Amino acid sequence: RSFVCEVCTRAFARQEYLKRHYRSHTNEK
Ligand SMILES: [Zn+2]
């Protein structure tokens, strides 16, 4: 199954980009 960022509900082609992408959520409000 694909991978969507429960944060920005953004989907990616790979979890990698997600895991990392999450690193950009360290401070997002
Ligand atoms: Zn996100």
- Which two three-digit tokens encode residue 26? 């360290």
Query: In which element (H, E) is residue 12 found?
Result: strand 10-12
Among residues 27, 14, 19, 16, the alpha carbon closest in space to that of 6 is found at 19
Asked whether the beta carbons of 16 and 27 are under 8 A apart, the reply is no
The rounded distance, in Å, linking the Cα atoms of 7 and 21 is 10
Cα of 23 vs centre of ligand 1, distance in Å, is 9
Query: In which element (H, E) is residue 5 found?
Result: strand 3-5
DSSP conformation class of 13: S
State the virtual CA torsion across 18, 22, 25, 26 in degrees, nearest 10: -160
The rounded distance, in Å, linking the Cα atoms of 13 and 28 is 22
Cα of 6 vs centre of ligand 1, distance in Å, is 6
The rounded distance, in Å, linking the Cα atoms of 27 and 14 is 22
Write b or e for each residue in 5-22: b if 16 or more Cβ atoms lie within 10 A of its Cβ, otherwise e. beeeeeeeeeeeebeebe
